[PDB]
Design a protein around this nucleic acid. Structure first.
Ligand SMILES: [Sr+2]
Ligand SMILES: [Sr+2]
Length: 95
RNA sequence: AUGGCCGGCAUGGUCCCAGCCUCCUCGCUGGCGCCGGCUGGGCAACACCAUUGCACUCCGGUGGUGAAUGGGAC
């Protein structure tokens, strides 16, 4: 099943050995160029490890980010990027 | 002494220097002889195992101390 365009991109296949704080910092280092980021959500729990949500202010940023960085080698692993299924809370609280 | 508790045995002492050791006051006002048994805390770090997982509620499991020695002064 495919996903529809979204403010938020969902990244998985991330290196699970990286600490939350550093992972957010690094993700920002490479994704900020695509547009203003509202937040980056990372959790190292059993269910949510290896994954991240990057919440852009504009959908065009998310879209550009998804196209350009698909398969990007990151901590020695190719990034897999999709649109999030649903809107992040940060986004609902505006639009 | 050890995260806490006990037993067998060995071993002259107090300082100074260097090297090493550790999940549980990484520190020079901790520790670094032999062997056996009992037991608590915690995944914070570290390691291993499992996990490819769509969140906006912090939240998988297991492991270790079964550790580390030389030199000088009195
Ligand atoms: Sr110790
Ligand atoms: Sr853990």
């Amino acid at each position: 099943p495919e996903t529809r365009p979204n403010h938020t991109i969902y990244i998985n296949n991330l290196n699970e050995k990286i600490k939350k704080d550093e992972l957010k910092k690094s993700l920002h280092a490479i994704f900020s160029r695509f547009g203003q980021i509202l937040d980056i959500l990372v959790s190292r729990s059993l269910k949510m490890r290896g994954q991240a949500f990057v919440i852009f202010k504009e959908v065009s940023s998310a879209t550009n980010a998804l196209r350009s960085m698909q398969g990007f080698p990151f901590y020695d692993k190719p990034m897999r990027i999709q649109y999030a299924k649903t809107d992040s809370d940060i986004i609902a609280k505006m639009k």
